[PDB]
Symmetry: C2
Subunit: 182 residues, 2 copies
């Protein structure tokens, strides 16, 4: 967390490992499945039951991944979505993931996004959003999605970002319920 010449949030070995080991997950469920492997790695690593990762929309090349590091990280903005997006733009040398020349980018996340991440996804340059758990599922193990605009789906769809949900919802709920059990 704390430094001075920088805002710095360190990552546990699995996340570091996920962001630096090559991986091509073509099918949507292959991406989501790997994202769920990370959620579980995260709990084991003292973090919230959320993970996400930016892949290139068509190939399924993993660019970056992120998990909740809010508590261990002392940073309320360290939602899975934020780190996965920001680490993706680091790796690609741009703040906009849809700058000319770059292959289309997808953020595959374990749960639907909270208001904050909802904004993050918009500015990010990402061209699609694939979720696992619904917002009900999320705000039924204690996590708050916050006041999003009515029709946040349409809001994202209305700027070149296509939304999908429920994908491997059940397996993601298994994961949610286990955390909430403990």
């Amino acid at each position: 967390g704390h430094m001075n010449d920088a805002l710095h949030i360190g990552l546990p070995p699995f996340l570091v490992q996920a962001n630096n080991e090559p991986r091509v997950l073509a099918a949507p469920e292959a991406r989501m499945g790997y994202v769920l492997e990370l959620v579980r790695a995260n709990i084991a690593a003292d973090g919230g039951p959320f993970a996400a990762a930016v892949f290139e929309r068509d190939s399924g090349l993993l660019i970056a991944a992120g998990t909740n590091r809010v508590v261990p990280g002392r940073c309320s903005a360290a939602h899975a979505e934020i780190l996965a997006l920001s680490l993706a733009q680091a790796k690609l040398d741009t703040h906009d993931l849809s700058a000319d020349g770059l292959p289309a980018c997808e953020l595959v996340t374990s749960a639907e996004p909270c208001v904050m991440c909802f904004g993050a996804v918009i500015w990010s340059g990402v061209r699609s959003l694939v979720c696992a758990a619904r917002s009900d599922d999320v705000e039924a193990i204690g996590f708050d999605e916050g006041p999003r605009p009515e029709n946040w789906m349409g809001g994202l769809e209305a700027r070149g970002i296509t939304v999908t949900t429920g994908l491997l919802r059940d397996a993601a709920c298994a994961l949610l319920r286990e955390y909430n059990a403990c």
Copy 2:
């Protein structure tokens, strides 16, 4: 870097977060926050800055500015930096955890939806704004789809909202960034 989320801080901003400072009046706080806007514009950042202060002493805790382009991080808004460096200095994700004083977030402009959310989770009890949502939209920058009545939305969470403070100077710092935003060299910039 791919080993940590790392947004680097320009020397002036390291200084801001280095040097102690107590600004009691709201105008005193917003004034410092707008020093940092023009300072940022001169360090390749966007026309936005923010600071976390102790609401009831005016002790500067931490400061932030748009480091989007130079940091290549669409998430690196002033608010996010200000709030995060405040959380890191104070050793907690929750700026309102027991033991810590009430925190205030002083921003040079009304927050976009992302930072609107950031505010809700930050821990801050109060957000003081300079430039109105309209002012920021006028020169291009997008606020994004904030929920209808986000202001009351925040106030309902015990987070107090104040906007338009030093709006004038805020507006002036916004236009001079615009007037020096193009690519053709204007030596006056």
